[model samples]
Target: HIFHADDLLQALQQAKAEKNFSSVFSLDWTVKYVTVNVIVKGKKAPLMFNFQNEKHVGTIPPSTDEEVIRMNAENPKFLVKKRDRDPCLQFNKYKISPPLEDDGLTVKKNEQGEEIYPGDEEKSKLFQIIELLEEAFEDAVQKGPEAMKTKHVIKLIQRKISNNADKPLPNPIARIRIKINPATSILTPILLDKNKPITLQNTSFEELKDEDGVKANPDNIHKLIESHSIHDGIINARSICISNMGISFPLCLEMGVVKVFEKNNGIDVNSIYG
Candidate 1:
């Protein structure tokens, strides 16, 4: 590609001299590649970002790998490694990347100040199939479904299907930090009852915890998310389609699963709004 770049430049110069730059069309511009590195903490780590029909993105810096390892130890990003599963089988991993130093998991210090291994992250899973449906909806909105002579209202469905054709139901996570761009695509708060001085919240998680600690109660957290929606209202670009069948229909189906689970546990779905 580098060698071809010089040739393309020569052709462009010729086209310029000939006064036919527009007519000097060449096939060399179509193909390309990109390289991106995953950053753990502030250090750079070697990583590849791949997508369908496109070269990867980003490049790794100098030998800052040690920092990357430390950062990964603290917070690693998970990426999809397979193409199976019924819905969006590709998005099963967590952002928690593996630690660089020892095992692919986090390490902690013990009383003797020695690095002791903490328990690894649990192999947990969420049944959030709505995310896949949401991706499909967003794709249809962006590409008008039939733009590529494809089926459905958006092109995302076909792309999703084609991307996951080999994968069957119940997709599993493998690699870490997979980037999935929808190619398309945000709040406020209220009074503090305490007499403490009112302070603005910062972007860091520490500030977030200061404002409000981790939510332990399911009802409490669910109400918090729902109420925030009510208070802030929805972004029109994202929420305007709430009434659209494409969005609402799938949303309803997702809610059906949630409702069934809640009912089986003797929990009322309506209580979410409570």
Candidate 2:
């Protein structure tokens, strides 16, 4: 059966009320195409639903050619040509656009006049559908088989989402570098500016192992950071650097602290944050 946009929108609206989203809106990017934006648990995300089941989102062409050669079962010399599965179809693909500052996804009065925006009832319906689309889009992404590719697409959307939520925070004189010794279970925070000495937030680093590396145990590192007093606390800065083995959410928190410092001093936050 074909996917009905109206039915899905209703389902989403019902779910949105249950979840209590902060903001939800739908904007017509084109005559027939619409974009849905939502703020859930403080994180804003955007998704373009395939209302008509166009088989793909926007105009993303296949990455590779459909035709490929296969080994012939009947004879070693014989070869068979087969088509590859479409990445877009393996899962329901939704488009993610960067959130713009003034996209007209809200209610407003205009001197430009009557036809500029939808009527009150129409506006309500639009937001209802938008909420449902956002809910469904995320649910589909989570359940989809192509986790890596789907996550990459989600990142593209979030990068744009971040642009909207990022209000400039005060810059710091310098960023603090945090390191963990796997062997010694020692956590050290070294203030990079003028080599200023600071107290260790957490005196103990038993959460880490000598060989476990800094990225291996994120929860313990976070706890260690939280265990400190304001004087020993790590402030968010833009220029922060982590000399570690891998990345984690806790690492992201530490990195955000560094970005504030860098931005304050006129440094650019790397695209890797996206």
Candidate 3:
């Protein structure tokens, strides 16, 4: 096979100029995508505040309740309990498929069970080279695990890619663990009355780990004061409802790929492995 054989047009010129190989055909290509899920957080009844230019999608208005304000003023402290909606957002899983090609990298019948490029062995080599090029090209565009051929390749790429391509890639073999405390915020939710403000707040009674490996616990509400008890309260609770959701990255897929590849291929993949 000639060095320039991968470029079909170049191959034709090289063949004519140097009188080397023959018979070139067209090529194929593809692009891939991946999907994931995440949870979003906000204020109690959580949608009351007008975030600058932001407004609720349709016709929803901020709260007009006076008791919620009075309650916040009396109890300035607030804390999130375990019974609240789970803070751990779950992402919907998705996949990316590999690319395909024609005449290139294919099998034809032979006495030895199969053959490539039928008549020309050199042409077969050229086709194989083109196949590799297709793989590299497809890889440049595909994100996450799609570009990986071996498990090691998958792990390497995973370590090199993060939330955004431009962002610094996380170390592939990370010993990531979580430290959980109580959810406490300083902002207060204001009711319809503009003249009054309240200082509602909460504190965590307890913080414990759950069976699901999540760090969370029921709210210990023994230490709290309602909104109206404080002086010069703005009718708004000083503290809004709080939530805690665990963060889960695809450590399993990335770690498993490296592990399996090491077991099968004897490649020393990453420093982050357990």
Candidate 4:
């Protein structure tokens, strides 16, 4: 097949529709969320606050409260568990489905494999790429995964080329992987009311004890406060509510095209695989 002999416009339209090459038709793309707990001194109570954006996994409609929690917790890919160690946060769970629906979510990079937020100059073409993949996913889901074909190309433009002209041009062994991530600001600063803002070191409570049954000095709270974000992450999301729901949610899809420079075993040298 001659490259110049082929039309650029028609070929682009087919690729834009993903009617070309290997397509990442399915296999869930997900992100892990985290959780936080607060303990003030005096052994009175664990002053716990819940984040509003816990994730949920299930069908949109008719998802009961119990059914929803059970489904989310059971799936290892999506779960929220506090750490075995005392005072550590669980970063694997948060709320929202088709995440990024809620406000203030920070997405530095998105599903379509590109930089975002700071990418305002590009108007973030990632989402536009995501839109193309989404249409494929929805159609795949509707028609079932079986429709994701392993063929080299769809016939839209293939029929136009005569005898052997469109017979699988070499070097099209693309492998697409759709990556969806937690769209929320991974974590930003939110102030705790009635607290002094300090530098390099930082927080609260007459203090607490650890699960090891060791009584720690109250100042341990502040000792580890600033360190948490620095060490693990400052993923403490803002706009927290009275109680946080520890669940993870769905997100946008990104298309990643991986190619092998040389032939690999079991994978053909010049062909597409879905």
Candidate 5:
């Protein structure tokens, strides 16, 4: 909860003091709190950037009085006012965040607007989850009988001679974007296409249609977010996670949600990432 700059400064200074610094840490999060543990090791002065356990994480007061609302104006980063199906609750409300703005969501683009890309680190992270999902699917395959099959798998392939066959099960959209409702700290991840030209888009995000402008196929509208405050102000919140197509094992409760900051430049991280 207490993210002192001293922790990061000490690690960085130690890393600099020694020629090499190998670092490791973990983050624990919930609607109410976050716990961070960090350790940085170099040759001479190894730094322990650990968190204090006794103190708590929340900043909001329980009661919403005038004094509370006054304090809330300054401290209102993660608190959500509960209501009947807010912008947070609607899965259909999953709108897109633009290409990489914060430090964590990996993106590579240009001033001139080029396609974005993330390299192996993101891909391998995705791959591991896929292996985990297949491990999960293995359980479903038990169908009251179990066998790890090859030619048996071949007969399974041939057994597709049924009248109720469907299309290639929406072939997994490999890319993922964590759509956040900045107003409410609501996070919903939607899977998406890759290499679709980072410099591209269509109908719905469009605001003013010129006299010659054409309305697009209505189905295409929902995928792109309808609006944001500014034009280029949007940052594509593209992150990598291996998806079982649309199947998601969600991490949050009805309670609320959260981000990691900056690209590695230890500069002042914008509060937006958190």
Candidate 6:
């Protein structure tokens, strides 16, 4: 099972109270993100909690009158709700299959249960790491409950390796509503490296000024707006509506990535987990 908001917060609070770990938390209104930085002095790989903004789940677009009637006729039990202002946004019940590989192969296995087409060597090494992790978990199961690993390592494994290396990583399935009052959210945490414990910095909402210099709040209409160069990095994307006033925006935006830079000392710091 994945980490739920309630479960994670409880654990974090317990850790701070019992273990006396230094904790820092902050939220970014513009980007709709929250971060919790935990510092354990002189410890390698300090804990970091990064939470993404809640998303509208199972939001079906407004359909034509005939289409709605046909759907209702087909299945009256699962009626499509009418859109009064915005499209029918339903939380806690959304799912999508993983995307196909670039080569379009089904990724079958041989008689011995090995991959039919194992691609690159570096990628192969990554999969091996995942296999080792799975084996470790199975070992724990064979032992006792005390042998079970902590939530921190489990989350790190999920973040670093796909459950099934062959299949595309499953998209984040929505299973709960985004908290509104204080903007509480669900997030996954990962151990990046043996670096210092990270700390929360600042908060900013994602708002862009339109042609008339009016600040357009994308969050209000559930649209994303941003621009950057093409590079080898992670991307968080979702299908969002476009404002008529800002028709030039791309339907989908590549919002995040692993930024690269070269230093005179030749030490390249690659920020992967955000």
The sequence of per-residue lDDT tens digits that candidate 3 reaches over residues 94-182 is: 11111223522223445786432323321223223223323332343232233232223222122243442533321111211111234
For TM-score, candidate 2 versus 3, the one ahead is 2
Q: Rate the local accuracy (lDDT) of all candidates.
A: 0.25, 0.29, 0.23, 0.26, 0.27, 0.28
Best candidate according to lDDT: 2
State in Å the error of residue 22, model 4.
6.1
lDDT agreement of model 1 with the native = 0.25
Which lDDT tens digits does candidate 4 get at residues 225-257? 321121100121111111133221122111111
For each candidate, give its TM-score against the true structure.
0.19, 0.20, 0.13, 0.18, 0.19, 0.23
Which lDDT tens digits does candidate 5 get at residues 79-187?
4331222121111111232255455333447878774544433332222322332332232223222222211211101112235353221112222222345576534
Model 3 spans with C-alpha error above 4 angstroms: 1-126, 144-274
Off-target runs (Cα >4 Å) in candidate 4 are 1-14, 17-22, 28-122, 145-249, 252-274
Clashes of each: 18, 18, 40, 24, 5, 3
True lDDT of residue 224, candidate 2? 20
State the lDDT of candidate 1 residue by residue for 7-40, as single tens digits: 3334444544675433333111122222212222
TM-score of 3: 0.13
lDDT of 6 by residue, 101-122 (tens): 4554344457997654323431
lDDT of 4: 0.26
Candidate 2 per-residue lDDT over residues 13-125, each given as its tens digit: 65566763323333212012223343333334443222221111111122123212212343355333442221111101122222223542323445774223333432323
TM-score of 4: 0.18
